[PDB]
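Q: What would this complex look like in 3D?
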Amino acid sequence: MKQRITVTVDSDSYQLLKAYDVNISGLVSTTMQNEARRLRAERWKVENQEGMVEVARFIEMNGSFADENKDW
Amino acid sequence: MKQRITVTVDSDSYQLLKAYDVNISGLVSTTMQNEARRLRAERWKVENQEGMVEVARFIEMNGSFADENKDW
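A: Here is my prediction, written as structure tokens for the whole assembly.
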């Protein structure tokens, strides 16, 4: 009558969720409901957008001095 | 040291995912990861959604600097 699905995490991200809101076990099956609905002659196709979000540069124009300097 | 997260489904949606692609156990900890990262508490913290573009220009500079010209 019941199925025990157990993802022995402690290392995986599961713990992250419960670490801040141990109310996901039910979510587990919830995430499947959305996928459940979704699963119907379709998967993703349209979802990935941009992909780039702040790559953190390291230049910001080095040629900038305001205290009598120009090292090298 | 492992943590056994057991969402005894059979009734919950878990089964739908495993009944059609029993490859979620890992997913459980993964789906929560994306949420784990995304964990930013509401949509109010610092600044808003970035990446606003009216067009699609790709000319931030000329190439290096303005120290030569001879448009031929």
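A: To summarize the key features: DSSP finds two helices and one strand in chain A. The interface with chain B takes residues 1-18, 20, 24-33, 35-36, 39, 50, 53-54 of chain A (CB under 8 Å).
Q: Very helpful, thank you.
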